[PDB]
Amino acid sequence: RFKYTKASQENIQQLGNILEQCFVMSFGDSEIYVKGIGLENFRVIYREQKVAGGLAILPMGQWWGGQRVPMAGIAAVGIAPEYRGDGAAIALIQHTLQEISEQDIPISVLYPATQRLYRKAGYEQAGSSCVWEIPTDSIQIQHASLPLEPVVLKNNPIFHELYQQQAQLTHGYLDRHPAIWQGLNRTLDTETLYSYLIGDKDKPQGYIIFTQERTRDGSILRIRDWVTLSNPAVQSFWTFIANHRSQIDKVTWKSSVIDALTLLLPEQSATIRSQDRWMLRIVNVCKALEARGYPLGVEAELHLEVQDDLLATNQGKFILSVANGKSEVTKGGKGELQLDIKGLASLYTSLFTPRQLQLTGKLQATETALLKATQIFAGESPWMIDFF
Amino acid sequence: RFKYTKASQENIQQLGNILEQCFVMSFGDSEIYVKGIGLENFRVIYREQKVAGGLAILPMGQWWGGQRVPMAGIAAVGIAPEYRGDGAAIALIQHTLQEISEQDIPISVLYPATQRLYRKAGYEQAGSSCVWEIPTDSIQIQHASLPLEPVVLKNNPIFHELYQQQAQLTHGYLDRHPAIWQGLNRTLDTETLYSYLIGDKDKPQGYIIFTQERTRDGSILRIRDWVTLSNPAVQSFWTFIANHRSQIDKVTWKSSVIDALTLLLPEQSATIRSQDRWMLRIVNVCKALEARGYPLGVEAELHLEVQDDLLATNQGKFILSVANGKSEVTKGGKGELQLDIKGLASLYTSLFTPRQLQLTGKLQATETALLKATQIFAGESPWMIDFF
Amino acid sequence: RFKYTKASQENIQQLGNILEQCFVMSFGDSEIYVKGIGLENFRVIYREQKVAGGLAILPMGQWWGGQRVPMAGIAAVGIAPEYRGDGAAIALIQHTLQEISEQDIPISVLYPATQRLYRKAGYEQAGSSCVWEIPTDSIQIQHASLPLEPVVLKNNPIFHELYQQQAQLTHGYLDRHPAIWQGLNRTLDTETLYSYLIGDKDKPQGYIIFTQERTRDGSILRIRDWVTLSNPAVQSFWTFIANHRSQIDKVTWKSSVIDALTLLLPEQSATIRSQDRWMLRIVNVCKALEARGYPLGVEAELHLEVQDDLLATNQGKFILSVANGKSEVTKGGKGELQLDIKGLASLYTSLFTPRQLQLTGKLQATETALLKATQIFAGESPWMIDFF
Amino acid sequence: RFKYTKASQENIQQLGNILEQCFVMSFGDSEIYVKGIGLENFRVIYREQKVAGGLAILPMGQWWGGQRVPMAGIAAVGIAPEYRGDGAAIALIQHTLQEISEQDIPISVLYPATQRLYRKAGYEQAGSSCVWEIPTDSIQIQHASLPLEPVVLKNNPIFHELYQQQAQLTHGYLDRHPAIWQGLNRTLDTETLYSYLIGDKDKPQGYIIFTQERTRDGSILRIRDWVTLSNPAVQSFWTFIANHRSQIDKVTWKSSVIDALTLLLPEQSATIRSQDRWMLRIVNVCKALEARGYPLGVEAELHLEVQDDLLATNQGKFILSVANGKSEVTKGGKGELQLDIKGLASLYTSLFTPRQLQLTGKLQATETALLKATQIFAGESPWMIDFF
Ligand SMILES: CC(C)(COP(=O)(O)OP(=O)(O)OC[C@H]1O[C@@H](n2cnc3c(N)ncnc32)[C@H](O)[C@@H]1OP(=O)(O)O)[C@H](O)C(=O)NCCC(=O)NCCS
Ligand SMILES: CC(C)(COP(=O)(O)OP(=O)(O)OC[C@H]1O[C@@H](n2cnc3c(N)ncnc32)[C@H](O)[C@@H]1OP(=O)(O)O)[C@H](O)C(=O)NCCC(=O)NCCS
Ligand SMILES: CC(C)(COP(=O)(O)OP(=O)(O)OC[C@H]1O[C@@H](n2cnc3c(N)ncnc32)[C@H](O)[C@@H]1OP(=O)(O)O)[C@H](O)C(=O)NCCC(=O)NCCS
Ligand SMILES: CC(C)(COP(=O)(O)OP(=O)(O)OC[C@H]1O[C@@H](n2cnc3c(N)ncnc32)[C@H](O)[C@@H]1OP(=O)(O)O)[C@H](O)C(=O)NCCC(=O)NCCS
Incomplete structure (x- = not known):
């Protein structure tokens, strides 16, 4: 059919x-x-x-626990x-x-x-995307540690190289397909794409890619991608943006739901304009678990029991053994922690903790298995800057 | 003066x-x-x-790592x-x-x-509060595992006992002062306070406290406090609320910024109406660190160097030694991780990770100390349901 | 249970x-x-x-075809x-x-x-209610044929007597329960109830009952009930309302969806603020059909077949014979027009024509029966001014 | 001049x-x-x-009483x-x-x-046009009796043939000038015109013509013309539209003020976005009355007296004799029903009933003439789907 x-x-x-x-x-x-x-x-x-x-x-x-999966x-x-x-x-x-x-x-x-x-x-549901907004005149940061320089984006390797550094450090970030970069470089005939590197010459520490427009509501600068590898890059980012206050009413950017950049603002002037959860x-099961990074200091064996009504090779019992930041997955065990392939997605990405997944009925476990899973899958809340 | x-x-x-x-x-x-x-x-x-x-x-x-501080x-x-x-x-x-x-x-x-x-x-900044909202007719859950029963709130110990169970389990929750409970029981002459227990008779598993009103925009049911200890309580919560769809246009509740209750909805229909970060x-330094709970499986000694320009007893070097979910703090050490008393607040509550605090300039550390601090302070994103 | x-x-x-x-x-x-x-x-x-x-x-x-049912x-x-x-x-x-x-x-x-x-x-669905609104300064009618006089509403028989005249003439109008009148006479402590008779002394031709208030949007005069038995009452109504233009920004009233009062305005300045269909x-079946009025000039026998899964006495075949504005219903016949008790409600009130009910699948009929039913149930679009 | x-x-x-x-x-x-x-x-x-x-x-x-005038x-x-x-x-x-x-x-x-x-x-004023709107996710009909097929509109006779069937059945519908069809086939370079036939292959029962766009408010699908000749076409229409719910926030269509399509929705979720009365x-007088269709079962002679200050041939007394769905108009009579040429327009189209026209002062008549005119001009509320 x-x-x-x-x-x-x-x-x-x-x-x-x-x-x-x-x-x-x-x-x-x-x-x-x-x-x-x-x-x-x-x-x-x-x-x-x-x-x-x-x-x-x-x-x-995709970067999970600092490994590209x-x-x-x-x-x-x-x-x-x-x-x-x-x-x-x-x-x-x-x-x-x-x-x-x-x-x-x-x-x-x-x-x-x-x-x-x-x-x-x-x-x-397995990760977050969040669009933040803020009035430009509420930023009030003038701490220009590093200069900004306009540069061309298209095929510029500097951007890929800074991106892949923040990506590797951010749980959930994409190792981008060429199409993602294409979309970022794409604008209406209407509009101009602005791209700046943050840092002293030949020592880039971050970047900002944005568009600007005038709407019925007023003027807006929409940051579509940014990288900040250090605090001087963060101060420089905010300073640059604060310096658009006479020309721009509002600025938006994409971050985590618990955004860290707002930690540096004098007041809580930023709000969440919209958010989305992406799915995984x-x-x-074996290859996904073996490809992911795990926290150091964890040594545990978690005995999983997984249901998958579509892909039979994932249906069954698996032992996840974690040590030295790495895993080995073998078949069998006692299936102390049971879940559907959907529960495993949310567990894998650290969106929700085992306890939270237990409470919302996405997994059943013994307290020991709950503890082992908490230790194994703990991590920064997953997010990506990209939409596709 | x-x-x-x-x-x-x-x-x-x-x-x-x-x-x-x-x-x-x-x-x-x-x-x-x-x-x-x-x-x-x-x-x-x-x-x-x-x-x-x-x-x-x-x-x-306040409940931190499951210990009342x-x-x-x-x-x-x-x-x-x-x-x-x-x-x-x-x-x-x-x-x-x-x-x-x-x-x-x-x-x-x-x-x-x-x-x-x-x-x-x-x-x-050290924790979050978030008001979520949702159209009642988008909930579409009818999974009434447990019954709901209207009960009186005032001085009813059942509420304290369910509250303190969710509190102890939620990183950042208050062990409430009587005034907090007072505020919850307080309404305008205009309005009626509704309180229900979720669960079979004499086996309560949660509760909901709310008010309803008609505004210019339409009707709204404002949930001011809730408890869900198990998945049947969560399904029952949503079912009860979904059942107000003919009478109520929108429902609001307070949760975490990464709310888990929305995991059970068929669609991402809920939005964040507002959020706030509270401060700590x-x-x-010694007593705060010794009173907090720590994750099990962590054995580490973190050598801190703290600045406090107000309370001299907190200014100096401290060794935080963590093992078996508990800490002991002694004076001295090598001050491998340096921060102001402000940086320590955000570190302590797990709002931001050491890496995130490093990046935003709230702490300086060696990679080993960064790892030890990450292991020590890891935890569910801090939040409370209460405002004061 | x-x-x-x-x-x-x-x-x-x-x-x-x-x-x-x-x-x-x-x-x-x-x-x-x-x-x-x-x-x-x-x-x-x-x-x-x-x-x-x-x-x-x-x-x-309720008044149907001019008979009280x-x-x-x-x-x-x-x-x-x-x-x-x-x-x-x-x-x-x-x-x-x-x-x-x-x-x-x-x-x-x-x-x-x-x-x-x-x-x-x-x-x-069987009838309509509609709230119209209009800017007071767009009425521009000064044709005060009849005077207006403030009078007391409570238990004033003049109102009942004018009401029952418009009621008897309006397909769908209530013969009001005392509670309806009660609701009309009821206002907030905040507000004053205004009631006027339209007509020369001792020759009333209509009336208006209303409240006024100031909102965030501006000022509004809300007409909750009105009667106009003649064109001089209609001109007088509009003149009176047009004369509130310096004090009142907007006026609302309840009418039919195809409101006739707007026929007299110079421009189409009135809009529908909201509408509702009530149900019947x-x-x-026998008593409802025998109690209703029918148009004069119609002589027809309609052979119905009705389904009613709740009230067995309505389930079956009925012959509706109409002549001289009256009906006689007997059991039996050939059931040339088949419908559920729901289809019969919409047919009975003239909300939708037989053809329209056929098209939306609420009835099946032969063309002859469709014609007979069209002739029998034709009438002004049903509405009421009251909500309950 | x-x-x-x-x-x-x-x-x-x-x-x-x-x-x-x-x-x-x-x-x-x-x-x-x-x-x-x-x-x-x-x-x-x-x-x-x-x-x-x-x-x-x-x-x-224009189709009046099923005859093209x-x-x-x-x-x-x-x-x-x-x-x-x-x-x-x-x-x-x-x-x-x-x-x-x-x-x-x-x-x-x-x-x-x-x-x-x-x-x-x-x-x-003589007929209505009404734009309805509805949230796509409130339709909730999945009763795909008949398939839909995308087809080309331009000069496609299937559309003319289905149109003229609904036209002939709808009191007030246009027999369209080529320009009307032109306007329907015309869109901005911005936009795509979508046209579908409803029905099994070679047995069309209706059609839908629409555009879609994204606005500031969200997404909208604007239906500019539609035909539904049977209930399976109506169910199929709604099913098709309900199936746009993930892509489209709101749908608009033009119908009658008392729209019948909404009879099939589970709830009254549709609202009137705007309405207009067209004029006639x-x-x-003679030719207009002789060209119109009349209801079957009516046999009456109505003696009219018409004023026309512009076209002298319409000023005077006319006898309208109706029988067997047809009329014959002769000069003279007793002018039992008097009106201006404007009153006659509203009477002719069935927008308002004789009683309603009497009440708003557009005609004067004896009760017998009022009855005869009511019988003669009764009909479905006039409307057209087209604007020009
Ligand atoms: C703010 C309020 C407390 C006034 O305090 P004040 O006596 O003027 O504050 P101080 O003179 O002690 O100022 C000390 C610091 O606070 C800052 N401050 C005071 N009011 C401020 C405001 N509205 N916004 C930002 N900073 C403010 C000052 O900038 C100063 O820092 P600086 O030394 O870098 O200049 C006042 O009561 C008010 O407007 N509203 C009550 C609401 C409130 O403050 N709530 C807090 C939560 S309960
Ligand atoms: C709706 C209300 C009556 C709850 O009733 P309830 O006991 O849950 O209804 P029941 O269990 O008897 O349900 C019977 C049918 O009604 C339907 N129903 C009940 N509530 C509904 C709602 N909010 N929306 C749509 N349908 C509803 C059910 O779907 C069911 O049909 P089904 O057999 O196809 O599933 C409730 O009091 C409310 O939310 N508000 C009061 C406002 C009101 O209902 N007003 C009516 C005018 S006075
Ligand atoms: C209205 C428009 C036609 C101007 O016409 P005009 O030559 O000023 O009209 P006339 O001088 O012939 O006026 C004759 C009558 O029309 C009325 N009239 C003209 N414009 C009017 C308006 N905007 N509002 C109300 N009445 C108006 C006059 O009051 C007058 O009646 P009166 O003798 O009682 O005073 C003009 O083209 C316009 O503003 N817009 C185009 C839109 C339009 O008119 N569309 C009609 C549908 S296609
Ligand atoms: C949704 C769309 C894909 C239509 O798909 P479809 O062929 O009707 O879906 P299927 O028939 O395979 O349905 C399978 C399941 O999906 C669900 N589904 C389909 N469309 C849905 C919608 N709009 N909302 C909720 N669920 C939907 C069904 O309920 C069904 O589950 P069930 O078995 O419990 O009933 C369509 O293209 C659309 O409206 N928009 C494009 C936007 C889009 O879908 N984007 C996804 C991200 S790229």
Whole structure:
């Protein structure tokens, strides 16, 4: 009934049209998008002989406990409205997951338009994204430790190199697919993209990428990506932004829900404009657990019992043995901590603690196993700066 | 110039008037407030022979790492406007801190109207409070595992007993002063206070305390306190609330910034309406560190170097030795991790990780000390449900 | 499990409390309400030995095709939230309907907070209520044909006598229960009730009852009831209202969705602020049809087939024979027009035409039966000015 | 002083400029508009030797009582602002009416920017247009009886054929001028036009034409035209729309003021966003009355007395004799029902009933004549889906 295939020249325009409709994109903005991602990354689902919908798979990485875990990002999931309510989206997602599994990519992440669909395939809330906003005139920091310099973003390796340093240090950050960088460098003809490095010459310590616009409400500077590796970069960031106060009414940036940059402001003038939880699917239990970093000082063996109604190789008992910041996973054990593959996603990312997952019914464990799992999976609240 | 004293019958009305003005309270609502807290808890500052302002000290406790640490809550800080800009508030706060110190209360917490003032006395951001909101018709949970029963709140020990169980389990929760409970039981003549226990008869598993009102925007049910000790209590909570959908447009509750209750909703329909960071002052470094709980499995000695420009006994080098969930603090060591008493507040509560505090310049450490501190102070993001 | 009873002194306070909670009434406003309606009119449902909820039944009349049909208004339906989601409301409604049936009252009407519940018991959309608003300075009518005179409303028979004239002429209008009049005469201590007769002395042609208030948005005059029996009363109404333009920014009134009063304005300055459809239950098919007025000039026999899963006496085939503005209903016939008791409600009131009910699947008929039903049930769009 | 002429190449640009100014059209959008309608349909008024303004006449039809009555739509009436307040618009309208009369077109319709002007020429409120809106997630219908299929609109006869079926059945619907269809097929470069047929293959039962966009408020799907000939088409319509809930926040459509589609929703979640009354001019009393359909079962002779201060042939006494769904109009009689040509417009369309027109002073009649007129002109509330 539903046939899953790679996109081809024969069907990429139809899919692009379906994507424009699904996401309410202005006429033809789908070409730029599809082109930025690459046709090779798009997948199509057919219903009978007609193109019903599709998505993009972004093979990349994600930083967990400071180790890069291969990760397949799912983007632009759309089913043409005439085919909706018929199981086409879940069929698509299941096929896609099977493909990711065959590629030995152990985890997959996406921003859901609707959670029910993705939970049917084993995705679960697993990390945060948060848009903060603040009035420019409330910043009141003039501590310009480091200079700022406008630089060109496109293919500039300095940005990749600073990014990958903050990424490796931030639990949940992407090892970005080229498309993510593409999106960041993309603006309306309307608008100018501004990019600055923070630091003395040839000693960059961070960067800021932003756009500015005038709206009905007033003027806004939207920071789409930033990096601050040190406190002098943080002071310099805020100073630079505070210095836009005569030209800009409000500034927004993406951070963690418990944002640390606001620690340096004189008052709590910043607010959360919006937030989202992205979801994660544990595609391969063994490989996902073995690829992740673990805290040093932890030596524990956790005996897990996992349910996975889609990918049979993940259904069963596994012993996770952690020592020296690394794990080894073997089959078997006593299954002292039981959960569905969904519970494991939230546990894995440290979004919620074992105790919190127990309380919300996503896992059952003995107190000893609860303690071992708390020690193993403890970490900074997961987030990413990127949307896809 | 400024004289600090306990409030007395001779000056409590003047202070009450100053408090009404400061906090924009309706005429005479200060009497109820002062009465709920008790005159013995109010302090006054004089400028020459005139009452310049004052505050309330709430001696109580706070749960950190599952241990109750004695804590002095600071409430209703007000200086009559004619005495402002003259150092009266900082004088007041310093005197107050000195008194708390003389009582051997090791920490103090408050919600600041302005941060600059309290940071001058060594308070720092240290925990969160967050008001969530959600449309009632988006909850869509009907999983009534446990019944709900309306009960009377006032002096009902069932509430204290369920509260102290969630409190002990929640990093940052208050061991409430009687005034906190008073405030919760207090409503406008306008309004009715609703209180329900969640659970089978004589086996309570949680509770909900709320008010309802109709506004210009529509109807709202404001949850002021809740407890959920188990997943059946959580499902029952949401079911009960979902069942108000024909009568109530929006529901609000207070939780953590990374709220776990929303994990059980079908969609991300809940938003953060507002948030606040409360502040903490480490009044006694040794006693504060020795009173706190620590994670099990950690065995480490952290050599601290603390600056405190107000309370000289906290200025110096301390060795924090942690093992078996407990600490012992001795004087001396190599001061491998240096910080001001403000940095120590944020470190102590686990609001920010050592790495995050390093990056924002609140501490300097060797990588080994950073690791030891990360292991020692790791914990669930601190929050409280209460405002004062 | 659920026991249905008349309210008594033993349970009316508990019910009143439940009603305050359900409808978000200010503390104690339920006493005035319960008192205005009368305890004899309240009904209670018990779950085990506890009061679970209740409602009020308002025995009165409704004008259909110019004949008064006995009608039981259902008001204040509430189930305490702890008993919701357990079938208590539908049990209550079914018991209530059975009681109405035993009293030989053929129809029942209510304003639903949620339609699904009442449709389970055979109520259906059947009439309209609409709140119109207009800027006072856009009326621009100064055609004071008739004078206005302030008069006292309470127990003033002039109002009843003008009301019953417009009522008899308006398809859907209430023959009001005393409680409706009570509600109209009821205001906040805050506010003054204004009542004027329109007409020369001792020759009243209409009236206006209103309140005024100042809000955040500005000033508003809210017309809660009005009567205009002639065009001079209509011109006089608008002139009077236009004359409030220096004191009042906006005026609201309740009318039909296709309001005729706006026909006399110079421009389409009036808008619909809100609308509601009330619902009707055909309690007795024969008696409801025989009590209604029919258009003159119609001579037709309509052979109906009705389903009623609650009240078996309404389930079956009926011949409706109409002539000389009157009907006679007998059992049997060929059931050329089939519908559920819900379809019959909408058909009966003329909210939707047979063709419209066919198209939305509420009835199936032959073209001849469709024509006969169109001729029989044609009429002015049903509405009432009252809410209950 | 004012000379009336057909537009020509010599003056269509000036008029187009005047039209851009009058209607606040973006620079040059008047060319597309003028082109879509055709220069032959535009008329110009001159003041001395200068072009003062103009309009478009749309010769088409309108469905009344299921018969197509020739109708001249008046569009784009504009007088350059320097010529306003001098009688140029009324001169234009009078000339235009005289032309329509000379073409034997018996009725004319328009959407007024200001009523006073058109009433001076005998137009009166006569039908409704209403824009409804609803949150997509409140629809909650998944009853996909019939499939939907995207099809091309432009010159597709399937659309004309389904349209003319709903048109013939809907009292007030247009028999559309080509320009109406043109406008429907016209969108911004910004936007994509979506068109779907509802029904099994080769058995179409309805259709939907819409656009989608993202605004400041959120996302919206605007339905500009739809057809539903049967209940399966109605269920399919709502199902399709409900299936946009993850992508679209709000849906709007045009319907009647007493919309029947909302009868099928679970709750009254839809609201009226805006409404308008269009106006009608009875250009030829005899021909207008003879062209209209009448209800079957009515046999009556109504003796009218009409005033028309513009078109003398309509001023006088007429006998309308109705039988077998048809009329014959002869001159004379006793003028038992008197009205101005404006009253006759509202009577003719069934917007207001005779009783309602009597009450608002638009007609005087004996009770027998009131009854005969009620029987003759009864019908579904008039509306159209189109604006022009
Ligand atoms: C949602 C969309 C994918 C339609 O998919 P579909 O083919 O109707 O979904 P399926 O029929 O496979 O449904 C499978 C499950 O998903 C759920 N689902 C589908 N659409 C949903 C929605 N809008 N809201 C909630 N759940 C939804 C179903 O309830 C079903 O679960 P069930 O078995 O418990 O009923 C569609 O393209 C859309 O409206 N917008 C594009 C935006 C988007 O979906 N983005 C995702 C992030 S890229
Ligand atoms: C703020 C209030 C206490 C006035 O205090 P004050 O006597 O003027 O304060 P002081 O003169 O002691 O000032 C000491 C420090 O506090 C700071 N401060 C005082 N009021 C401040 C304000 N509104 N915003 C920011 N900083 C403020 C000063 O800048 C100063 O720091 P500096 O030495 O760097 O200049 C006053 O009562 C008020 O406006 N409202 C009551 C609300 C409130 O303060 N609540 C606190 C929570 S209970
Ligand atoms: C709705 C209220 C009556 C609770 O009733 P309840 O006992 O939970 O209802 P029941 O368990 O008998 O449910 C029977 C049906 O009603 C429906 N229902 C109940 N509450 C509903 C709601 N808020 N929205 C939609 N449907 C509802 C159920 O879906 C059920 O149909 P189903 O069998 O298809 O599932 C409650 O008092 C309330 O929230 N507010 C008072 C306002 C009010 O209801 N007013 C009505 C006008 S006076
Ligand atoms: C209104 C417009 C046509 C100007 O016309 P004009 O030449 O000033 O009108 P006239 O001088 O012929 O006036 C004749 C009558 O119309 C009335 N009239 C004209 N403009 C009016 C307005 N804006 N509001 C109310 N009445 C108006 C006059 O009061 C007059 O009646 P009176 O004899 O009782 O005083 C002008 O083009 C405009 O502002 N906008 C274009 C929008 C539009 O009119 N659309 C109609 C639908 S296409």
